Amino acid sequence: PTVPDRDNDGIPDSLEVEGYTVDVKNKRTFLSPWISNIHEKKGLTKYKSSPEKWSTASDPYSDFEKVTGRIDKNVSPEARHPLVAAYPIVHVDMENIILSKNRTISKNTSTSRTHTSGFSNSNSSTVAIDHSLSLAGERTWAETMGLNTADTARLNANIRYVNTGTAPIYNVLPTTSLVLGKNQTLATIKAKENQLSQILAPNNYYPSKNLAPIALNAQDDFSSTPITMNYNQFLELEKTKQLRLDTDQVYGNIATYNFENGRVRVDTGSNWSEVLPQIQETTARIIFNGKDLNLVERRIAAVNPSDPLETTKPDMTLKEALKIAFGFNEPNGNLQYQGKDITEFDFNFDQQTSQNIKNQLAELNATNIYTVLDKIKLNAKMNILIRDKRFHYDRNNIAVGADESVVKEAHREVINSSTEGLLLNIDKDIRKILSGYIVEIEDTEGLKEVINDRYDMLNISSLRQDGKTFIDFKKYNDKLPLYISNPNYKVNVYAVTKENTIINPSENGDTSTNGIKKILIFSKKGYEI
Amino acid sequence: PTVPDRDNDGIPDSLEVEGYTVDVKNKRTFLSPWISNIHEKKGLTKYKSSPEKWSTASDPYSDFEKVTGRIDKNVSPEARHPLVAAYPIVHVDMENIILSKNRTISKNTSTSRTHTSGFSNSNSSTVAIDHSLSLAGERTWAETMGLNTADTARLNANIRYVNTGTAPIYNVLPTTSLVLGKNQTLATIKAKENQLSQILAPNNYYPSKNLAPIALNAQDDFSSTPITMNYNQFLELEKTKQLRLDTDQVYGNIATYNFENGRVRVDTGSNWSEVLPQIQETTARIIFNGKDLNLVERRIAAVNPSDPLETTKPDMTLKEALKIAFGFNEPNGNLQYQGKDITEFDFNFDQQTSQNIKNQLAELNATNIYTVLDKIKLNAKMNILIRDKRFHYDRNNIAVGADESVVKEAHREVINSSTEGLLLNIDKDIRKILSGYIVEIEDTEGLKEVINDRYDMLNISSLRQDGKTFIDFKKYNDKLPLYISNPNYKVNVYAVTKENTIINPSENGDTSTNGIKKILIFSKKGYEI
Amino acid sequence: EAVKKEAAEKLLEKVPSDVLEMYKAIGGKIYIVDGDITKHISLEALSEDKKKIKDIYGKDALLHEHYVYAKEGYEPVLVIQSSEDYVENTEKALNVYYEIGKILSRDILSKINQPYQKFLDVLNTIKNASDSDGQDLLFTNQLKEHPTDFSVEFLEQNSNEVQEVFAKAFAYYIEPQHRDVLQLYAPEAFNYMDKFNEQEINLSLEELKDQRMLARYEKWEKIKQHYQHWSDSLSEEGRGLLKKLQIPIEPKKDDIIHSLSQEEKELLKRIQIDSSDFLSTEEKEFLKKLQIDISEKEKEFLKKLKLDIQPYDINQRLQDTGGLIDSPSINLDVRKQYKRDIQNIDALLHQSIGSTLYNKIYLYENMNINNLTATLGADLVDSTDNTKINRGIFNEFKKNFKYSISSNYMIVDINERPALDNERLKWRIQLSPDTRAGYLENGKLILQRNIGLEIKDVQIIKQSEKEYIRIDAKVVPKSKIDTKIQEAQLNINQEWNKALGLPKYTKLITFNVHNRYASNIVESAYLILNEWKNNIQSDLIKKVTNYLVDGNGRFVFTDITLPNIAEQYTHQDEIYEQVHSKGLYVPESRSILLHGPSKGVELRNDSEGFIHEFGHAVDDYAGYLLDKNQSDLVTNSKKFIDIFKEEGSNLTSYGRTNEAEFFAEAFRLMHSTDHAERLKVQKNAPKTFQFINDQIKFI
Amino acid sequence: QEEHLKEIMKHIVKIEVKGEEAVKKEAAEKLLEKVPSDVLEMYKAIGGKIYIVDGDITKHI
């Protein structure tokens, strides 16, 4: 009658080993053993867990509390499943900069969370500075700022913090250092003290998109120009136009749930820097770019044959991991994510993991992993990266290009065309790997007139408030309507993908789009327009 | 004997799920199951709550403590009901400024708490400064203050704090940053130290209307003029005449009730900054502008399908929410707010919320929400905005105008008319959407002479101490009585609504009320006057 | 299923005294079904307009909707629409209890006419309670409109309304969570249900079985086998003795006539028979029979004769003597005759009732109210309609009726039988396994003597259009009651010692009582003396009390015949000097004796009986103060004898008897509570009025 | 602290009022109680017994 539950985690042993489920009874919640036939019709998920671990994930939330909902209500749903560690991952996002000398270059920046290869448990980002020339007269970066060989420029940027993880941080915000090139550390942004009293829930901004971003330069008297930068440095920057933002994991304290009064209180004893290492040492880490081709990281608890205590965890087959971590489902028993079949994805493995999986496929006598997916055992310390198979990628695992045919197919729907511009509707994901467009007109006898014959100009495609892509050639046409020397002359439009773009003037300071690999994107005659 | 109480909150389970109420028996209070026939004559409200939550609302007050009254006596009455979260909402009100250069522009201001749109959970306000000329000769600020291109002006404002929430704050006072334009942060208001020893009960000012408002500039030696302001900045201000006040949610400690001896002591463990996140992720938010056209926000506990624990809360239909949150009642079984039927109000939904309600409206086969109102299910996180259907609104959801026809009825009651002015009695609410009046004279043959023919000369309407509006003609006249060239000449009075007002001289500095959209408001001949 | 059946199982488990047992007895059945719309062959026979039902709150009405319903007649069966949420859903459970309580009151209790009056007064107390909350809770508007208080006719005329109010209360009490609610708004009602559902309900069940003759026979049969060995071992002397006990033994005239044989018989021949107050009516018939065959010193010879013509009635001596068998109140030979038979009978009841074969058994006995108190018995029955009882006199009777003791041999029945006209009491006696008793073949039982009984309740019940008094009882050791009497003795004596000024420890109001109406007698002392004190001049009491205390005399209140107490017999010394009446005064012992049980053929109440005896003692002291050496009364002084010759006949004929009693009648009258009476004696005996004031002057 | 309140509470708050004159009778009886009962029997046997007056002891018959 006692009911033995050694781990002291509320759920009894047999329940944990065999399978249980939470089910709301009219207004009272009770825990029940899985009955195959009567629970299935209501769409309840079959849980499993460890009878010997107070928190199977090893994160600060018990097996019981998570599934019952007795937990900080901010943890994202996807982490409600008993086998996914919920923990924070903070990186910094820089939106725009301004420059001067210890005539102000104010450019908007774009950042992407990065990942490179032997990849380690440390967050880093990579900013890319806009190259298009916002001002006509701002030829030559060296001159627009009266920069001298023995001068120094001051940098003043705007940044915000982004949480793409699964758990909240409370007081602290991590210190993080900017670095140019391979090893030239320009500055480390101080960790302001007792000022980040607000909360960073997953998928939220700090400060939120509705507030002024934190000025990077203090604007106070702490240092006149904390971010000094020698001449050679500025040159290096012009040649690379790319920075790195490395951050450590010194987050704050943890909020735990108290049974006596149901209060979620911030405990001053527990600190994330003690929990994170265990999790990072007992889970397989999977990176997925399905949602928006951005690096989303999830962690699953896997078995390690070598450890007695660890054999207690439920054997976890890959397919289910994918099912519970991201939203994959089986309408007809075929794995798919919002239409896209599983076969459209790549599998990349670290050398260790490679060896292990080669073994697993050897004891099964199979060659196509896509079939035997549900018979593959996951072990501890595997690292898996699943990226869409259709796109080309660079060294920093950022989406950088793609095969032309997909690109062309993405345009076969011309919603409108006039002498004032095009109003297209392209799938929101593609227009982030296209740097810009070169528009040109072709005489009936094979001539070629490129309107924006300047590399910077390319950026001519804006987006209307109704999600319709709109190309405004007017800005670089000197506010002159597009002229056509022949109602029979075809108008050709080409698109340039990121991978094939140029970021600085060429050898002979070429401004023409000649040596650029160009893809044909449009061709309507003059009468058709 | 067991009388099971899982949530451990004093009220037993069965009572909590179906409905209970406390009723005073001669001098002793006890808990009883709702009896339909014996309580209704006594006028008690039927409560419901969650048997598995120490505080169904999730705010720092237990289900049991709150309804019985063993609780801090400052929580506003309407928030005593268990399904209305009680928490603070602080914004800042600035009463008047004065200007000079590091010939003093001293103007009185009026502020309104703002909210704009994808609208997020962060308090901010917006002041609008009157443009009217207090002094005749004070044309052009640039000259009234000897401001030069290379000069600097000093800013000195007066502010007071208003608590429009539902719970008291004790120790701390919020940080708040001043911002002109889109992103030019002029100042962050210091957190005065060991000075907010007073209390902010709901609907109160700190300090009270009887005391000097807190001078913004320290008047001490901290910074001579922290709020410097370059020339170009002053220009931005001149075109927009508007400011923004961004404030965060870093409140103080919490006042809790101790059952053993009834002492309410401020516990140093609980801090509002750990609780707000809970509220913000588990309630549906209802914003209402009914009372005085000021935005009052309330939060209601709604169910969230995805979470077992959350499914326990009593189902909450919209109809009761308005009843229990604001004071709506059923004189004749028809929902109305102080006479005004529900049909005179708009329903606006966030894109998320919109989608959800469309589903709910389909399985009921209805098109007019006003019918199935009591059949609309609330899910967690909808944000709902109920505004008076009769008035026009601007981008920041502030009351800004109305249909002209409505304006006229508000004037059909001429209590008296003479050659010295009108003493009207207008509904206090309309006379906050009228910027000023145009006075004009009409020759017996149809000519038109407008007395106050300057953009900044409209503030001619005062209010008498008995709430009777009194219009003074002699103000912007020559301190002379009213002349009439013909007892047959018609006397017209014009009103100018906010939306149609000008805030700066035009291109060619026009000051005439020519290009102002005017609605006809009055026309009496000389005999009537 | 398993849980649903278990769910129902738990519901029925809360029912208090397993009301299923009477329910099955009336042929009721319990069915767990689904879809009561779609109901069952057992039901569906009444699909009519009556399909509209009102829940506890009175709102809904739909045969399909509501889950609980009962057949409502002719061995009704109830359908509950079985489900699984009944355990936790109170609002769903209340209706289950509400209808189950409704069939009990409408079909069960109605079959035996209870509730009757006992519930009615609760009702009256509800519409007349200070706060108007409670009424609203237990009855609809139809009842609310009643302008006056609820009488028995109203309950019998509607009966639908009462069943409704009753059922609701039953329901609220069984549901654990609402019990507290009940106590707050209807305290008395809670009290009623509280005592109802936990002791009388078991008592109530048996009477239901008591109507089926077969059941009665089974109980009777079950008693037979237990007594087979004892019965088989009965001797002739026991049965012969037992035979005598059942039937009263009549004296034979021929034996007595042959027993006198002297001149007294001739003397008796010519005597004015119809002129003796001492003789009673029944004794005159005996004398009249003898007279056919055959105010001076001849009435003294009649006193002896009275002590010899009484019938041989064993049971009767026993109450008269209170268990003191050695009383020298009768001839020694007769005394020897009685003592042997009872002691022999005492040995006969050697078999104890105690067994493992049976639990709580209740027995009944019909008894005449005039046997306990002819004073109450004289006005107990409604003057106009003998089938109803006047509540006003009833209220006095129940007041202090709390426990009783039986010193004689109880003759009890086994099954209730119709009573004779003069039997209005219906006793329900519980027994203890330790009580010694004898069994009778004629369907009666003989209990051992010296049994103690505590009264648990006093109520009016209805049966076959005639009114009765229902009295329950539990047998207990007499000693437990005896302890109450001494502690009661001390409470009363200590109080009056302070009020009078006497030494703390005097034994003055000592009373020894062993009869059926004991408890009221004791409490009635706390009232006779209060009226006694407030009405007499303070200095007279102290002075007179001093006289009594100066000797060992004590007041003695009893429930046995005066000639048998202790003091009376010893000093008189003559056997024939015995006297019995409502009161008596012994000058020699200076004691006042008050026999409660009898009723003064003249006196209006008990206090007057006391005052009369009080007169006799006081009259003695006045004469004592005149001269100490001589023992004499106030009369025999030439200044009073004459006064009796003139005014002696201007008042009641009873006082005209002689001088001694004459003083006593006037004494109460001059101090009567009705000033008119005082005025009356003034204008009827003016001389005495100044005379009496002269003896009391001596102070 | 919560412990101590109870003991003081019982001593001071007399729940019901015996009455104006009952206390007098109750006081004397308790007093004579402490003397061994056997003494009282000896007193009665030798005759007179103690009676409690209420007024000025100086004036009694």
UniProtKB/Swiss-Prot annotation, chain C:
Effect noted on mutating residue 139 to A: Loss of ability to bind to PA and non-toxic
Bound cofactor: record note: Binds 1 zinc ion per subunit.
GO cellular component, one term: extracellular region
Effect of residue 97 to A: Loss of ability to bind to PA
Region (IIA): 212-246
Annotated consequence of substituting residue 100 to A: Loss of ability to bind to PA
A single GO BP: proteolysis
Stretch list, region IIB: 313-476
Record region (I): 1-211
SUPFAM superfamilies in the cross-refs: ADP-ribosylation (SSF56399), Metalloproteases ('zincins'), catalytic domain (SSF55486)
Pfam assignment, any one: ATLF
InterPro entries in the cross-refs: Anthrax_LF_cen, Anthrax_toxin_lethal/edema, Anthrax_toxin_lethal/edema_N/C, ATLF-like_dom, MetalloPept_cat_dom_sf
GO MF annotations in UniProt: metalloendopeptidase activity; metallopeptidase activity; toxin activity; zinc ion binding
Residues at which Zn(2+) binds: 612, 616, 654, 661
Regulation: Inhibited by NSC-12155 (1,3-Bis(2-methyl-4-aminoquinoline-6-yl)ure). Inhibited by phenoxyacetic acid bearing alpha-benzyl substituents on the C2-side chain. Inhibited by sulfonamide hydroxamate with benzylic additions at the sulfonamide nitrogen. Also inhibited by sulfonamide hydroxamates with alkylation at the sulfonamide nitrogen. Inhibited by hydroxamic acid inhibitors.
EC number(s) from the headed UniProt entry: 3.4.24.83
Sequence repeat intervals: 231-249, 258-273, 276-294, 295-309
Role summary: Lethal factor (LF), which constitutes one of the three proteins composing the anthrax toxin, is able to trigger rapid cell death in macrophages. Acts as a protease that cleaves the N-terminal of most dual specificity mitogen-activated protein kinase kinases (MAPKKs or MAP2Ks) (except for MAP2K5): cleavage invariably occurs within the N-terminal proline-rich region preceding the kinase domain, thus disrupting a sequence involved in directing specific protein-protein interactions necessary for the assembly of signaling complexes.
Family (UniProt): Belongs to the peptidase M34 family.
Subunit structure, as described in the record: Interacts (via ATLF domain 1) with the cleaved form of protective antigen (PA-63) anthrax toxin; interaction is required for LF translocation into the host cytoplasm. Interacts with PA-63 homooligomers (either homoheptamers or homooctamers): three molecules of LF bind the PA-63 homoheptamer to form the PA(7)LF(3) complex, in which the relative position of the N-terminal alpha-helices in the three LFs determines which factor is translocated first.
Protein name stated in the entry: Lethal factor
Organism: Bacillus anthracis
Gene giving rise to this polypeptide: lef
UniProtKB/Swiss-Prot annotation, chain D:
Annotated compartments: Secreted; Host cytoplasm, Host cytosol
Domain of life: Bacteria
Consequence recorded when altering residue 11 to A: Impaired translocation into host cytoplasm
Induction profile: Positively transcriptionally regulated by AtxA, which, in turn, is induced by bicarbonate and high temperatures (37 degrees Celsius).
Outcome reported for the amino acid change (mutating residue 4 to A/Y): Impaired translocation into host cytoplasm
Function: Lethal factor (LF), which constitutes one of the three proteins composing the anthrax toxin, is able to trigger rapid cell death in macrophages. Acts as a protease that cleaves the N-terminal of most dual specificity mitogen-activated protein kinase kinases (MAPKKs or MAP2Ks) (except for MAP2K5): cleavage invariably occurs within the N-terminal proline-rich region preceding the kinase domain, thus disrupting a sequence involved in directing specific protein-protein interactions necessary for the assembly of signaling complexes.
Domain notes: Lethal factor (LF) is composed of four domains: domain I contains the first ATLF domain that binds the membrane-translocating component protective antigen (PA); domains II, III and IV together create a long deep groove that holds the 16-residue N-terminal tail of MAPKK before cleavage. Domain IV contains the catalytic center.
Family the UniProt entry places it in: Belongs to the peptidase M34 family.
Subunit structure: Interacts (via ATLF domain 1) with the cleaved form of protective antigen (PA-63) anthrax toxin; interaction is required for LF translocation into the host cytoplasm. Interacts with PA-63 homooligomers (either homoheptamers or homooctamers): three molecules of LF bind the PA-63 homoheptamer to form the PA(7)LF(3) complex, in which the relative position of the N-terminal alpha-helices in the three LFs determines which factor is translocated first.
Name listed for the protein in its UniProt record: Lethal factor
Lineage of the organism: Bacteria, Bacillati, Bacillota, Bacilli, Bacillales
Gene designation: lef
